[PDB]
Design a protein around this ligand. Structure first.
Ligand SMILES: OC[C@H]1O[C@@](CO)(O[C@H]2O[C@H](CO)[C@@H](O)[C@H](O)[C@H]2O)[C@@H](O)[C@@H]1O
Length: 580
DNA sequence: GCCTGACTCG
DNA sequence: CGAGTCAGGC
């Protein structure tokens, strides 16, 4: 059954109402330098479909888009705006992003189109996108008539659904979160994505040749030791060589076969020389295949930059995600791997790279919400939390605490943050469940408030059906009452874990809002590039480094006021590698 | 076209 | 506990 709409051949003064539901269709998954297949407006005067060539040539339309005084309602506006920036066009005045409104209501729904968002309010008038454009190889843009109806139907939805969603967000006390946090942050992400991060490709290609060389050296050693050749990247194949051919012990079996995960390979090391080499191989293979090669083919030959997409509405906790490529997971922990970060340089000559990161933010978040006295005091004095923890559970003095002790006390801390599993803590520290429990038991004695919180958060999450972060983000946990022990336990952990991970998310996001404003006031050329959950990265002129040092941490540290101080450590340098 | 297994970062 | 990317197997 048709929907009435005008397939325009020219822009009109009634298409430019000061409030409209706007659709700008980008079908490309990666919207950087990707085409715009159609436009559609819906407002008090009617519904119109515009062809991009027509719309995006006209001053009145292009002016309306950019006009902040004209209000747009959209679904996934960041997509559009970033896409428009690649054509030299500002998209402003967007005052309601439906995708964001759905994500806040229930992160679990996996809302990723207008239909998905729509179904949530018993609106079935619009088809899903996967339905219209197909999937994979046969994926295609249909003929104008089919397309035009669809775009209008989404616009129609967005128009119809705005008020209803905003009503709910209100009821939840999430109206401010959407309007004053998630929506603005979206603008900033759009600037960060479009800005991109400059890559020194020749550096990487050099590293490529080096890594390649060592691989052939290492791999060849394996065939020598293995007594034959085989595909080392094949789990099944390797398993045959190790567990059958060389007769090593089977310490763990994966669901489909044998586990060759590093943790296992470590224990097998003493038995045969080959195990150590496979480990060396994997890290060398990983750096090469993913971080050197995978990185190279996602650089635009024009800008010589990498432009990631930050998925803002995907995570269950309120965190961000990074894709094509994921810049949130570039190796740091191991030095050989870390040097890859050398290929990440400033955009403009005589500029530097700046990094600002929170110190133990998740644990600071815990002290506040949990109201543990021993935790707050520790942080108020700015102690090393892992040593302190270590001191309390072993009943020792700093002098007594040894590196192994700190490593363990740390595990408990990350465990305590990640929900509490003896299985997990034992698996992690390589010990018996009965042990991990004695640790956890002694922990709760050291921090009775942190215990009390874990109890209450599970009980509230049961009584309410969800848990809320510091800003009023939400995660529904229906398996909290499940009769299955395992299923119930996972939700239990999430119950405890989510207000931490999400509140840490909330703060960094708030920081960014404040950070942008400040950068604007000071008229600094310093710009945000990346965010990695607990840290931000900028690039500014060498001349600005001294003011940033005073500004960036303060704004981060002042984002919110907790019962403990926030602590921001910073670093700058020529390359990303040198920001540390 | 998906799933798996291993490994990368917070 | 969150995420994402590659190879191989199917
Ligand atoms: O543009 C990000 C936005 O798009 C969604 C779909 O609504 O995800 C699509 O695009 C992502 C980035 O290109 C892909 O990772 C994903 O596969 C694709 O569905 C949302 O998830 C996201 O908020």
């Amino acid at each position: 059954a048709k929907m009435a709409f005008t397939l325009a051949d020219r822009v009109t003064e009634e298409m430019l109402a000061d409030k409209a539901a706007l659709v700008v269709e980008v079908v490309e998954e990666n919207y950087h330098a990707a085409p715009i297949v159609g436009i559609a407006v819906v407002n008090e005067h009617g519904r119109f479909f515009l062809r991009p060539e027509t719309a995006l040539a006209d001053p009145q339309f292009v002016a309306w888009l950019g006009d902040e005084t004209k209000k747009k309602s959209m679904f996934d506006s960041k997509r559009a705006a970033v896409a428009l920036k690649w054509k030299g066009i500002e998209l402003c005045g967007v005052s309601f992003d439906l995708l964001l409104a759905a994500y806040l209501l229930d992160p679990a729904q996996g809302v990723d189109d207008v239909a998905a968002a729509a179904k949530m309010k018993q609106y079935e008038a619009v088809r899903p996108d996967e339905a219209v454009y197909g999937k994979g190889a046969k994926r295609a843009v249909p003929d104008e008539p089919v397309l035009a109806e669809h775009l209008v139907r989404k616009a129609a939805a967005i128009w119809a659904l705005e008020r209803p969603f905003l009503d709910e967000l209100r009821r939840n006390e999430q109206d401010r979160l959407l309007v004053e946090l998630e929506q603005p942050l979206s603008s900033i992400l759009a600037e960060m994505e479009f800005a991109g991060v400059k890559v020194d490709t020749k550096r990487l290609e050099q590293m490529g040749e080096e890594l390649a060389e060592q691989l052939r050296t290492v791999e060849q050693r394996i065939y020598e030791l293995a007594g034959q050749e085989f595909n080392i990247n094949s789990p099944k194949q390797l398993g045959v060589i190790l567990f059958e051919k060389l007769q090593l012990p089977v310490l763990k079996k994966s669901k489909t076969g044998y586990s060759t995960s590093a943790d296992v390979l470590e224990k097998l090391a003493p038995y045969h020389e080959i195990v150590e080499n496979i480990l060396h191989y994997r890290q060398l293979g990983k750096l090469q295949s993913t971080y050197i090669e995978g990185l190279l083919k996602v650089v635009r030959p024009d800008t010589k930059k990498v432009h990631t997409i930050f998925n803002q509405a995907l995570t269950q906790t309120g965190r961000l995600s990074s894709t094509e490529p994921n810049l949130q997971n570039i190796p740091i922990r191991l030095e050989e791997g870390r040097k890859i970060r050398q290929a990440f340089v400033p955009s403009e000559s005589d500029w530097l790279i700046f990094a600002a990161d929170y110190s133990q933010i998740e644990l600071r978040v815990l002290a506040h919400i949990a109201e543990d006295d021993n935790l707050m005091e520790a942080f108020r004095r700015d102690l090393d939390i892992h040593t302190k923890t270590a001191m309390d559970i072993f009943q020792v003095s700093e002098d007594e605490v040894t590196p192994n002790m700190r490593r363990q006390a740390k595990a408990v801390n990350f465990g305590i943050v990640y929900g509490i599993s003896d299985y997990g803590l034992a698996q992690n520290l390589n010990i018996s469940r009965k042990e991990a429990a004695e640790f956890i038991e002694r922990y709760f004695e050291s921090f009775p408030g942190v215990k009390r919180y874990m109890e209450n958060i599970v009980q509230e999450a049961k009584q309410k059906g969800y848990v809320t972060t510091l800003l009023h983000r939400r995660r529904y946990l229906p398996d909290i009452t499940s009769r299955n022990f395992n299923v119930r336990s996972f939700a239990e952990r999430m119950a405890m874990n989510t207000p931490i991970q999400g509140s840490a998310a909330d703060i960094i996001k708030k920081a960014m809002i404040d950070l942008n404003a400040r950068l604007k006031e000071e008229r600094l050329q310093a710009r945000l590039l990346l965010q990695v959950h607990d840290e931000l990265i900028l690039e500014a002129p060498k001349e600005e480094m001294e003011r940033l040092c005073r500004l960036v941490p303060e704004v981060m540290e002042q984002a919110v006021t907790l019962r403990v101080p926030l602590k921001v450590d910073y670093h700058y340098g020529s390359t990303w590698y040198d920001a540390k």
